[PDB]
Write a protein that binds this ligand. Structure first.
Ligand SMILES: [Cl-]
Ligand code: NA
Ligand code: NA
Lengths: 135, 145
């Protein structure tokens, strides 16, 4: 995707990815910590080990609005400088990240907390659900 | 540079970087989470003035061994599948990562804990000495007679 600036909140069938975000985002002089979480579809033995991919769907408008709300809360609550919350829609192969959260802050203490908060809240409140694709 | 495999523990003047590591590393089928921490030199005016860079020095062998010990501990204590612990030596300009820790595991819970553990334990136990390299004009921040 070609954009003027990488969106902080993204929900779509395309993807920017950790490499591009980390490469393009300029860390502010007052920030000394970045904590990135990548959620990846698994094909663990406990699920049969026959999963080839996951298909993600959502209520697009509702989801992105709630995602932005969580981002706002994360920044205000932990005092970090920036937070990215991205999630893919459509087909996602096992091993490919489908969920991304990047927190940028002054120190690691609050940056780790910020990332974990955004990740946990997103899972509890954002309307995005998966479907397994077998074989 | 030094692939084949990227060394899980690395200490030197060169740098693999998060982009290359995330790009090359293949996530195992039983892993659903990756937690990456990047430590970056920051300008700390509360330390006397504006900083240009952070310098890191050490006796590599000793530092590397403790880093490897911490890595093994992280994997064992948290049950994660893989852990990378990298750190740069020499001068690192503000904004450029100098410390990297990547934990790969089954779920969020243990992966986050593992990364935090490796990071905290490294800062407490690994003998890498740091020095803030201030920009010219430091004497202007605190003025007496
Ligand atoms: Cl909607
Ligand atoms: Na990614
Ligand atoms: Na890096």
């Amino acid at each position: 995707m070609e954009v003027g600036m990488i969106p902080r909140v993204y929900l779509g069938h395309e993807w920017f990815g950790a490499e591009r975000i980390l490469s393009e985002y300029q860390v502010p002089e007052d920030c000394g910590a970045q904590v990135l979480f990548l959620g990846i579809p698994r094909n663990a033995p406990e699920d049969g080990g026959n999963i080839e991919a996951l298909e993600y769907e959502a209520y697009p408008e509702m989801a992105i609005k709630e995602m932005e709300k969580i981002r706002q809360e994360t920044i205000e609550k932990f005092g970090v400088k920036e937070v990215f919350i991205h999630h893919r829609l459509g087909l996602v192969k096992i091993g490919e990240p489908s969920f991304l959260v990047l927190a940028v802050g002054g120190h690691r203490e609050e940056t780790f907390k910020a990332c974990r908060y955004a990740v946990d809240e997103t899972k509890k409140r954002v309307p995005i659900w998966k479907k397994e694709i077998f074989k």
